[PDB]
Design a protein around this ligand. Sequence first.
Ligand SMILES: [K+]
Ligand SMILES: [K+]
Ligand SMILES: [K+]
Ligand SMILES: [K+]
Lengths: 445, 445, 445, 445
Amino acid sequence: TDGHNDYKYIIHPKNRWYKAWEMFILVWAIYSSLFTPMEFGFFRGLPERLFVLDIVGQIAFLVDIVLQFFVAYRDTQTYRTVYKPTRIAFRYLKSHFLMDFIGCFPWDLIYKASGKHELVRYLLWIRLFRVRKVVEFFQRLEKDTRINYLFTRILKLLFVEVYCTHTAACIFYYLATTLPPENEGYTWIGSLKLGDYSYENFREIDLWKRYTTALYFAIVTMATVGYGDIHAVNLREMIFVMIYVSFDMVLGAYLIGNITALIVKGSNTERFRDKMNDLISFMNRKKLGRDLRSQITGHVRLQYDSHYTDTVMLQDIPASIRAKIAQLLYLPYIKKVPLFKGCSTEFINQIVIRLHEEYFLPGEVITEQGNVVDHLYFVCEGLLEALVTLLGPHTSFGDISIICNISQPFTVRVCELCHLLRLDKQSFSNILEIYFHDGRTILNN
Amino acid sequence: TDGHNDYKYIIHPKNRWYKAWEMFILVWAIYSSLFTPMEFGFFRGLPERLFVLDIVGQIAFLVDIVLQFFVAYRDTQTYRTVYKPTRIAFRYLKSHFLMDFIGCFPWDLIYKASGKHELVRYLLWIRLFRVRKVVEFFQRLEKDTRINYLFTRILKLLFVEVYCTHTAACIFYYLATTLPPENEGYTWIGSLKLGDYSYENFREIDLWKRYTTALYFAIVTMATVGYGDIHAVNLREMIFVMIYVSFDMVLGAYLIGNITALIVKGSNTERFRDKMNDLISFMNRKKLGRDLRSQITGHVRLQYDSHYTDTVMLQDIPASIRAKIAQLLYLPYIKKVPLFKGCSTEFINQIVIRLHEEYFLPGEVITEQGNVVDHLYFVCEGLLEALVTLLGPHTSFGDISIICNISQPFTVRVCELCHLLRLDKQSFSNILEIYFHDGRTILNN
Amino acid sequence: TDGHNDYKYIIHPKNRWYKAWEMFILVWAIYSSLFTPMEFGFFRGLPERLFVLDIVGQIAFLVDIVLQFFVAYRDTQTYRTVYKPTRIAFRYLKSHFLMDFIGCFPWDLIYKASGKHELVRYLLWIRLFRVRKVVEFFQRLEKDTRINYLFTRILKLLFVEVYCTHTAACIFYYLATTLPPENEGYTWIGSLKLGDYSYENFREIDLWKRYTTALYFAIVTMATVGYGDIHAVNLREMIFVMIYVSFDMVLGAYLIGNITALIVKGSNTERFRDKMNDLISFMNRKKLGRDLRSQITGHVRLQYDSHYTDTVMLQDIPASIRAKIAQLLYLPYIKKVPLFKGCSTEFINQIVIRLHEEYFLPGEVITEQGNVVDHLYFVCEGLLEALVTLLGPHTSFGDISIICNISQPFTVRVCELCHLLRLDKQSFSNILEIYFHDGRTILNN
Amino acid sequence: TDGHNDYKYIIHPKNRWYKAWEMFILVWAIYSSLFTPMEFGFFRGLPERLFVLDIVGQIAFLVDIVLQFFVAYRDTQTYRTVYKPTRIAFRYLKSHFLMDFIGCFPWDLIYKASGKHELVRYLLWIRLFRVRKVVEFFQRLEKDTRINYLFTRILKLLFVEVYCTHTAACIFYYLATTLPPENEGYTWIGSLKLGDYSYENFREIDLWKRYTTALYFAIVTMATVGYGDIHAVNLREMIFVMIYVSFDMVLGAYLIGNITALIVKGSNTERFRDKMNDLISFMNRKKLGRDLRSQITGHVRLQYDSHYTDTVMLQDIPASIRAKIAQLLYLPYIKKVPLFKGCSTEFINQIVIRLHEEYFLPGEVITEQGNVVDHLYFVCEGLLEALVTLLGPHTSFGDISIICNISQPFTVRVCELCHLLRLDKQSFSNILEIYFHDGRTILNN
Ligand SMILES: [K+]
Ligand SMILES: [K+]
Ligand SMILES: [K+]
Ligand SMILES: [K+]
């Protein structure tokens, strides 16, 4: 049914070893996309101590480049995995090969060996295409797990603001170095003074102090607090902050809208907790007794912990798996009454449709004597009494009266924890109207 | 049905005296969780005047520790209260015993008697586990009262912001004391100047001025106003404010989303106030008369003050309590017509299903002469006329015409306040089709 | 039906002259609730030029006090207007008499004539109970007009922010005057300097400059901009601004939530504009022709301008007014076919139920030849052709084929603007199954 | 059907050349509405180099004025295009002629030639009525394209904030020039100092520096950041900023509400992605097997990519176009079974109602042996097996058993990609109950 593995060169994408390589390269992509604006903004050429780290950081991405010619992929309009080499290679060469290949050049060595022209350093910015691995990690997370999709959209949106503030801090520091050191007093950092400390001659301050000051400015700006102890003084800095606040206005509105859309679509538990209020306000706008309505409030409080299970599989998709699990679950404790002592298997797998499951309290009254019967009760386990018999597990009652349209002679009550099954004789009568092999064996008592 | 109180050592959790102890310890937990950051941040060791208060404040929590081995608790998967001592003790020793016990040590005396090492004072922060009583108070409030659940979620969220601003103010003051007094001018408070007052030599300013300044900074920061007369100058202070504003951005978005989700799920009164607009715009997009549509607008305005009571108990839960209250309410003013002079009790408790309650105005017209009858009217009290008889309380009409399919001879009108009951003869005919002991006695006139 | 006007002292509340007095006193209540914080905050005793205005401003409220013993009011649980004098007077004396009476005392003369004690001036603040007229004006506006209720709730909430900023500005100015003039440099205004202008000796600056500065501070604070050129320097001013920003945080969240809840509950026009997109995307996800689907898109675009009128009066309230207007509208252009040449009036007022109104385009095809008929068309006006006759106004067709279950012989098309009525013969057949006096006269052709 | 083009002077509004003129004038309207506040605010009379541009800019609007007497327009209450000259001219002369005509006067030459009175320059502000073309462009965009209406409302609202900040910057600069140059130190720009640069003698600073400073202030104010390095010092400037922040508070609340209302009305894909979670949590709250429920989860994942197509054309509008495309699509691969070898065309175009389209996986089981048949399967293409025959394209099965109420003898399974059609024999039986010409030819095998 595969039609392939006649090649034995191609890697199945859901292999165990290949999924270990994919999480190795994601950490390198996270590190490489955080270091690149710091390399562009705070240096003009790397020092000697970062040479071997800069060389090692590209070998992993070159190995990842050569691996993509050996991976099978799943087609979109069809749903078969392609195992053919030329179809793999042409899809790679038309999608992602070019930027991945030219982001692996040694751009720090080319800058130092060609007379230190500043426009050569602008090609470092194409290494920010490596966040593709992070967006593919977030795309794979939201489909196949047990967490809802809106929470992952909030976490995905929260990851974007960290990256945007870090990049804005690096660019805001870089703009101050495009003036000569003799015009230092006309920049945002060369004229800064905080406490009794002066930021003059700022190119010789160590790296983490400058980075912390720039990140402090960017994070205070992004939250719209804006103290004003650090601000812009140039025209280029004014243009940069005018672009930056316009972007994060829309970003903050998107975050607020996503959190609101999460909260508005609340859960079903509070979709019946309000119904509690409507019912008891109806019961108390006029006057009424207190005892058996407190009984029915405890009843619905334990009943709504099971009644969400009804609507999800009433008839939403027409599966025969519900017939399989219905033969699996209910009637292996219902064959044991003499009611179904000799019914055909047609009626055993036909009965299962309207056995609704509800749980009850040790203080309710089960059935009435002066009654026309409505529901038939089918017990899982029980120690429940009646005042003439005490009904136990794997039993039933009520069918002594309903088909012959008689009142029940029993006053059935409870002292224990309940698991019984509903039955209306609407479905019993209409399919007993078709098949009566059972109906002979039901009235054979 | 209890199976216990054979021990007589165990306290029922819904006792009257025990609920007085629970509100005594909640005030101590509120006080103890507000004083602990002020003790950590503004002192290095307590003075002499707080000694007896510090000793007394732990005795109540030790007594509360020894009381938890004597309280019965309600099981989760079962719903019976456990009264056994070893099952109580093992649940306490696996849940909450450790942090409650080690938060009761005298950590101020241990700090002074071991050479004043600063790391010993960090163990004061485990006394913030005593806000468990406040979150359990807010969990008990939202289930069993007459207030809706979203308003309590807004009040619960508003309590968190007070506690967060108070703790942030204490930590922001504490960070300034981790420098020596000779580097005082490189702190946020040691370099502050407001008006013509200087904050130098700040360790000798009295306590409430320092606390008020720090709380003013924290509350102005939390609302995102940010005047900038107080700000950070260090690197540790910059890192602290970078963490703090990122937290309250998400907190403010959560508050806005909760208030919006409260407002969007509006009440039913304005769910028919718009329906007023749709109906009268339909009536006025074409031309129509004015008199009897003003009648029906006053009619629906007094009718929608009762028609919310229909849907809540049509058939939502299948209770026989509605049959009990239906025998209790309606027909003790409906037996008094000669219509039901001799009907069986089966028909008396069967009739009750489709008597819908509506109230009317002193100016409407009740019934028509040239008619096929649709509704049957069953009056609570009345002084209403017809032009040949004036119908009063405990009466009926319309049944002279409907079962024999005749037109009504009466022109029934009103001058008084109305309480009558609807009836369609759909239900009357289909259950009169089953039982006619009544039907003999109805036509016995 | 009134039972009263046997008194002739009492004023009906919906009189014409009394509604002129109610709008006279509303302007005085607006003026009196804006002037009172300016009188408290910017003066210590009024000057001579405001004496006659201060005296005149209380006479109107005294006259309004004596008028409330002569107004009839509508009861709540009943809905009759009460005309009895003692029932009027006791309701006034238990609701609103006390604060209205003691807000009319001459508190400026009492302050000057009792030694100028400052605590006497605090009784001016009970004149802010006169905003009751504004909240009653906003309560009367939202019930009985043609504007929706959420827009009036937004305008009501926008009125509150103006009043809150004006009162906060007056209190913020008042706090600076509670220090002596020798400690002037320790206040927010006594130490202010803007441009090359100094605010020293601030008690002799004229009134509108001081008021404009305080209102500028309050409005910049309320919008959370916070420039920081004006700020607090005292402890009492810090406590005041800490209270003030906490209030308007919740106020701004309430405003955002109300505007969002207005926008989310959009109109029905865009509730079918999306349905346009779903239908044409279904029609274009597979391939299809272009001509007659462009016809049906123009059809539904002119059809949804009338199909909102269906659901509002299908069966929502069971009125006979729809039978009255149904005899008024449709069939006075439908009696003119020989189809209903002699039907009984029972069938004339019975037919009206399923004549749905739709409008059409000059390019559609009306009917088919090779057909089993589904709908019957009942024209208002027309010049529509068929290829053998050209059907005009007050006519019909299709009934030549449907009751005898024949195909139609006509190919009916259009060139003009359409107003015809639907009819399914489901309703025609089931009520023709009951009454056939008509059925003789229908087949009398 | 037109009734016109007997004039040959009038231009049809959907001509090809006229739609080229409409986009030419939109660029001139955008330029003219951006230049006018810069001409009012930063100059007192234009210089010599802008003379020919100022003259040329009005000739296009004069030509556009004379063109509007020759355009046909579509009536509102009718839907016919009017081609009559006097009806065109009177609508123009009552709607838009006056402001368009008097905005074309040479107001720069009139100011210089009448003694330079400043009130003459205020008539430049009536050229801001030319944004009518931009609001008509945004009105035409949102009706007839493939983008949803709420996204265009967000983009329309984002365009307003750019125009409002640009106009506010020009007015804020203009207010500083209304004082003499000797009171320069009492303005916002004449007292400004940034870094080591001073803004004194500000009328001789070049234009783009002044404009960039004013726009930086306005954009920082609009986002509610508010650094405070530029602020107001006068009373007129205070009044202007008090008006401006009150406007953009409501504007920001409107933007947040629109984005939230976009996000809350999410798409249908995540309206079944939650249903995945509810179904598998129902299947895993009790214990169950893993194999065939993983089958049905892959089934519903490929099934919900087609089941949105059902509800949109079940019965929403009653079109015969669905009968036309139903004869076009399905049964030209269903005539090829001997099941419909000789049925009448009535049954061929009657069958089409309940053939629902679903797609399946290469691993499912199609049918059962021990069965009462529910659905009938009608294949597009297939290579599917049974264990006795391998069923291919243009075939069917299941009808060997269902009409005679027999069990199926086949165990039908799959290995390929599925396109089969559902059929319940409810519709087959009820319309086979009417027409049995087919029923003879179905049982003719
Ligand atoms: K802000
Ligand atoms: K600020
Ligand atoms: K701010
Ligand atoms: K500021």
